[PDB]
Amino acid sequence: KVVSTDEYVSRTSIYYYAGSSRLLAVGNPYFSIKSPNNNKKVLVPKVSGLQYRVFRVRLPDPNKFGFPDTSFYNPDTQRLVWACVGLEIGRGQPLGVGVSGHPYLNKFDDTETSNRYPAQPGSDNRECLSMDYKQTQLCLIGCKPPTGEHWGKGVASNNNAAATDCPPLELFNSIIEDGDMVDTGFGCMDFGTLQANKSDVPIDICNSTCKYPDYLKMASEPYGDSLFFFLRREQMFVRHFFNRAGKLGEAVPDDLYIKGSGNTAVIQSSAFFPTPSGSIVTSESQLFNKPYWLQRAQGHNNGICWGNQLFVTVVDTTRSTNMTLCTEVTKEGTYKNDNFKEYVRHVEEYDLQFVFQLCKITLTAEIMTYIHTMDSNILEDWQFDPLNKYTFWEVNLKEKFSADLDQFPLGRKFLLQSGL
Amino acid sequence: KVVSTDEYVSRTSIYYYAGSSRLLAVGNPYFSIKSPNNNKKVLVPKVSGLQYRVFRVRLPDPNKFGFPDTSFYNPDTQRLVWACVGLEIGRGQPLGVGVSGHPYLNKFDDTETSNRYPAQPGSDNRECLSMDYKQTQLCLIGCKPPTGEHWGKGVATDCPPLELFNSIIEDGDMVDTGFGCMDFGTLQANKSDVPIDICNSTCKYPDYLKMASEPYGDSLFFFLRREQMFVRHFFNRAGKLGEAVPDDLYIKGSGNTAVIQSSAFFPTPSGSIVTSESQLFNKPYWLQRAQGHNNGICWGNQLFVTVVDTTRSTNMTLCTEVTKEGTYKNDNFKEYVRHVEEYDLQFVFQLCKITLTAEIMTYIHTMDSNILEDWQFEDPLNKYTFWEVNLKEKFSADLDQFPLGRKFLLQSGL
Amino acid sequence: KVVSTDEYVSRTSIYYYAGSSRLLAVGNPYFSIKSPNNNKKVLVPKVSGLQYRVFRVRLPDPNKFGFPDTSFYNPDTQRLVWACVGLEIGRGQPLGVGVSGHPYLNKFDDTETSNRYPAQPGSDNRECLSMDYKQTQLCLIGCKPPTGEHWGKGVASNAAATDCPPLELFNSIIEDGDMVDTGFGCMDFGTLQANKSDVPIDICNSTCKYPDYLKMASEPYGDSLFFFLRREQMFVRHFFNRAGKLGEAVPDDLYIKGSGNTAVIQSSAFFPTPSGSIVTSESQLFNKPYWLQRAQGHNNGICWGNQLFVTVVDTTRSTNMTLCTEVTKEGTYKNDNFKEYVRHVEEYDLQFVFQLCKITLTAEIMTYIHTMDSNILEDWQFDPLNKYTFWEVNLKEKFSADLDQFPLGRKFLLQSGL
Amino acid sequence: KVVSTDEYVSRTSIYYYAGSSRLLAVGNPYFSIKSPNNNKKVLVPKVSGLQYRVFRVRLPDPNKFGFPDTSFYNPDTQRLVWACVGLEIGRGQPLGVGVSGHPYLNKFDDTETSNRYPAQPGSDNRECLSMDYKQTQLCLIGCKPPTGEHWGKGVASATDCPPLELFNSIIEDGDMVDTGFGCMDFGTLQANKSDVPIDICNSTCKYPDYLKMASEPYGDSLFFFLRREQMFVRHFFNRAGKLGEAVPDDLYIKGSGNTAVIQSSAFFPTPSGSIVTSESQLFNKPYWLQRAQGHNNGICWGNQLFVTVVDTTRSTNMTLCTEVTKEGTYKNDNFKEYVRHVEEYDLQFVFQLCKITLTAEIMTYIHTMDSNILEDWQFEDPLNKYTFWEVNLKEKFSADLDQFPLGRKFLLQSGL
Ligand SMILES: [Mg+2]
Ligand SMILES: [Mg+2]
Ligand SMILES: [Mg+2]
Ligand SMILES: [Mg+2]
Ligand SMILES: [Mg+2]
Ligand SMILES: [Mg+2]
Ligand SMILES: [Mg+2]
Ligand SMILES: [Mg+2]
Ligand SMILES: [Mg+2]
Ligand SMILES: [Mg+2]
Ligand SMILES: [Mg+2]
Ligand SMILES: [Mg+2]
Ligand SMILES: [Mg+2]
Ligand SMILES: [Mg+2]
Ligand SMILES: [Mg+2]
Ligand SMILES: [Mg+2]
Ligand SMILES: [Mg+2]
Ligand SMILES: [Mg+2]
Ligand SMILES: [Mg+2]
Ligand SMILES: [Mg+2]
Ligand SMILES: [Mg+2]
Ligand SMILES: [Mg+2]
Ligand SMILES: [Mg+2]
Ligand SMILES: [Mg+2]
């Protein structure tokens, strides 16, 4: 049924470079700040190293592009499309690690070395704690937005009496949007719905959904439009061991321990949870600021940018430093806490660089039938929308294409790579 | 006496792809929840990153498969069998690490830096502690279920006699965690010396030496393994010391130091860091030349894929609000723990034919009398627990339509 | 339209070696000691392993240089320029790690494991703490000084919800003595942290700069980066929070309010301390030759204006030495009888191999060079950098044609087969 | 003078496989439990991951072996000997790390961050502490038992410090490897029995004398060896007891008042071997003994072979607990705690048959090298006083190499 694009897409010797120039995002890493009463107007966006960046790269329609000489194809019988053959994800700002926390984290005891009986809980024993998250680098490239997976609240059958009030778990797929949170060491789950107390994870995810890329689904899709290519590097270890306050929903069964007495009469909560740590960041392990040459994709789509668009998805927690800002409210000769206000800001700097190869397609009755079943919108647009409900970082390159490759960094690299 | 399958199994140019699609397991990482109607029925299974996953992969009988053209062999004199030539173990979910513990762990003192005399008094000094286990990745492939080794109570100091037991590793068996491959249920009577997810369980380690040395090599067509741990903390045990330190190894104390402290030490392990670069999975294995004599031949039209992967052992915190109120109160919330595992098994099989001469029939009959009987020329494994993966209806000849199929075609130049 | 220097710069077989000999800097790692009342009289300079070292390397003008035989070009139509083809940044002193701190660091609570309610009272809870910074090695070489990036206060200008300072990304020339980022970011701490206590004293009144690699790599002519190497690393050693008012409160949808003991919310103004971790010989970028054969940009090592800029950060020798003087000698130890000092030193040895080049100044090439930099033709007869601070390295009298008499020269001859 | 065995040992195309099958040791990692009846009889042996395992592998005498066809040599002028050309040290049990300790360790103060004045020990300040030792993997192969080095007390001969002497000895099965406290006779050099954990405090820890074994003329001790050691300092303590050598006065300014009584500078660290990983394993893989660095290229003179192993990467000690009295609530006195350690080995060999023509020149050469070779050939045993793990392969030699794991690996690797 499905065939490689190499069998019906003809490559030309025409190459073009396109660069986004510097892209900047500046905001609060823990939450967005709204303007009242407009609870829907964002004054300060949420900008965090733990966010997916999903760039929707717009390319100029090659069939309406002003080429100096169009004698390389026949518009009566052929249509043009761009193919991505080179990519470099520029990253500015120094390497660094940010931290996240909760002024009311649901941590009760430290359970690593000393947690003797008896335990005297109360009604509110939450603590103001912070941590450094799991480290993640990844880059996804395709002509279709990426698919994520996360656990959310499912539906339980009301037939039989519930042996547990644990919420039912369902694995959801969804498009990863720009700004979505990556998993941080506590799983890819909807914390807003599955953690009702709002205190079991830090505030930058406690009311969010953390998504993980569904690599298995995207790799098995027939046409392979999601993953032309990808890199990923994750790492974490357990930094600390705590337990939760609150009622233990599922009691330890009686065959797993001998009951205590006296000091040990009242069993402590075995609702354990670890804190993650991403450990060290290093230049040597960087995935970015280096060229990717998309020569042969594992899927059937070998870098063909159908619809004259492209999707670059990035996670990079190796520059997650959060800057401390401090203003002086009242100037005095001696230090007073109440004379200053503390703020936290995070920034992200990208510079997307591309090398595109012009391709032509001879529209025979057989190829037209193939492309129609693959995606009818391809032929319609060639003259031979539903993604607007999602949020992407728009990168318009319609006016950025240049045939002079050697005038740009990645272009020079491609010419040396290809022998041109 | 034993010969390579290459000498009597003839290979064809017929290849088939088969995949299980997404396989999900969801449950409680520490213990199963039983039905209120029948305490022997499991309602929420025990699902842990420290379990063996033993998939029993069922293949369609090629001698009864609906091939469009059968002119490539003669059923009057030959029989067919699949050979596994490629495998990829897909693993979903993010990398991560879970923890396990015990509300009444038998830890007495911390013996790392400061543990002066006299020793604390007590009849129950257990503590509520947790830890992160030794890290293990492994994959085993064969047409016979894997054999594990573990220590149990043997046959008869009052120390229990130790016996090394071999057994089939079943789906859901626990891997060793840093405290050894032993039957903790029978060898630790107090139920408090290891966390609750293994204190009433048996931890098994693969008996690689036994499996590699078997004549026909049905157990290990191929395997990979990566273990790691270090000692995170140093504790000692409460309870009477069964074997006192001999008098020639110390000068006796006196007064405050007269009552010797327990030298029943035990460490807590740690698996350290998990990293993408160390992953054994999500990559193709090409089973070209097995070290044993069975070069990937799936006798009985079945295949066993055994996996341990603790690098995705995250345990999710879930919390329900029993009573909604404007200020926080612990009694208004219930805390739960759940763990998930996501697999996607992908295979490439090669059709093979065997000419059943008097010499080959004799050889095979001695190897496994069931083979010829099932060929027309009660299953002893049904008492064991595996995760059956039924690929009877999943075989396809269009390799290039699937990820592993495309990798195989490039690898082999086809 | 920019073209490679290979297309209009002709290479000769003339090579010269030049070395700076030993370069030493000695001072206080945390601050300069100025004259009691005089501002521009520095008694002890600030010298730290966290400083950029930016060497402005002066070369002899080849058009005025006394070659033993000048019969290799035509002054009527050609001019000469040096090309850098070999470099080794010599580093003395042992590998080591220094620490920096603040006697009044704005650390309130340790938020790693135990930080229960209620919050401690007080108007000044600052503490005397130190830390070891993010580790950085880097070397940049070009004929133009490097460009840095850092965050500073932007236009005042979005005020009803927050009074946070406006942020703007500023580009500037990195000067000798500028501070590299340390784990708290590349920002102007002097203006953006008004309490002067949120970072150690060696950066709290300074601007930390990070090289703007992206800008320097995309400049049309490529004069900034003939070649560069970089190696950064850090992890989070500790977790603290800040004292002072929280400027942007946590939205109410991210938590359930406390009560009684937990009624007054603690500060979520968290901040980590960095650690550069281990330094090792095998990770060194220095004390090894770099052969500048083919640059990534269009300037393939051409030292226009007869100068060269070598920029270095090297925190792997950041040991700060303890010095103690005895004011009064007595038979028993008394703290008041001694004075404690801290000193840091840096030892460099810059080594170069240069290749003489000639340019035939045709009408086409003259037009190209004039558009590139009009000073080139004017200086040939065919300074806006003085407002900046650099470590001046004068090699005008250091050029030698006897390459095999010097370490890097022998390495060059062996490398090229000459 | 000394020449390679390649010059006078003729190689045949006859190969044989032999394996020990599973070898198991089970015991107490800290001490043996002696005769519950009488006499030096061990009921529970000392079995530790920090012990040397020295296997004395006995081969069948090829000059008396039942070869199906003996026309390949002439016993009137030739004798046969085995040469080792392949080995694999099988290791069972999971990777892991054990700990060792002392209920009365001579640790006084923690000297890492806070150790203020004044500080004087009482009469008994010992503590119940444990630690994880330096990590060591090593394997040595030869036809002669390995030589170890260790420090002991020298001759009696401004200080009362015991004289030190470097001793050489044969490493015996069960000997302790160095653990991070050095290769010394702790039994004689630490008279208080509390300065190191109980599993070495009355033992001698030996280190292989690589330099002595590599320089021996004939090279019988080390056909081949691998080693991997590692440790860091986990904690810093000092000792109680009188400091034998006071710090000289020129190295400090005296204290006064509460600092007038100087604290002991008898420091000592605790080691840690750090992480164990599969990727660092030396075992469970074949060694092809193709070209030895010494002159003996794998010739098993006397029809025996010595395989020495240290492997602390499976040093897990198992906890066992018996219930003396069953009750509905937990009580410490109702249970007894035990510690057990196990070791699992599977030694696999490929041997190549060799013949030696006994010319006048070779007989003289072999007689000077070792006269017993010719005597046993007919052309007591001083090693019986030592303790080795005996591995009898006399009945285990097989010519069907492809029926066994290492045989198949050897055939595939050699192109046979
Ligand atoms: Mg296109
Ligand atoms: Mg959801
Ligand atoms: Mg939500
Ligand atoms: Mg599992
Ligand atoms: Mg993955
Ligand atoms: Mg107890
Ligand atoms: Mg058992
Ligand atoms: Mg066994
Ligand atoms: Mg064997
Ligand atoms: Mg078989
Ligand atoms: Mg991994
Ligand atoms: Mg996970
Ligand atoms: Mg897992
Ligand atoms: Mg040096
Ligand atoms: Mg406090
Ligand atoms: Mg910029
Ligand atoms: Mg270094
Ligand atoms: Mg050098
Ligand atoms: Mg330095
Ligand atoms: Mg003095
Ligand atoms: Mg070695
Ligand atoms: Mg091994
Ligand atoms: Mg092996
Ligand atoms: Mg061991």
Numbering used by the authors:
A (entry chain E): 20 to 403, 438 to 473
B (entry chain B): 20 to 175, 183 to 403, 437 to 473
C (entry chain D): 20 to 176, 179 to 403, 438 to 473
D (entry chain A): 20 to 176, 182 to 403, 437 to 473
Task: List sentences from the manuscript.
To understand how HPV type-specific antibodies bind to virions and inhibit HPV infection, we determined the crystal structures of HPV58p alone, as well as those of the HPV58p:A12A3 and HPV59p:28F10 immune complexes to resolutions of 2.0, 3.5, and 3.4 Å, respectively. The structures were solved by molecular replacement and refined to Rwork/Rfree values of 16.8%/19.8%, 20.2%/24.9%, and 23.0%/26.1%, respectively. HPV L1 VLPs form by the assembly of 72 L1 pentamers, and these pentamers retain most of the type-specific neutralizing epitopes found on L1 VLPs and could induce a lower anti-HPV neutralization titer than VLPs.
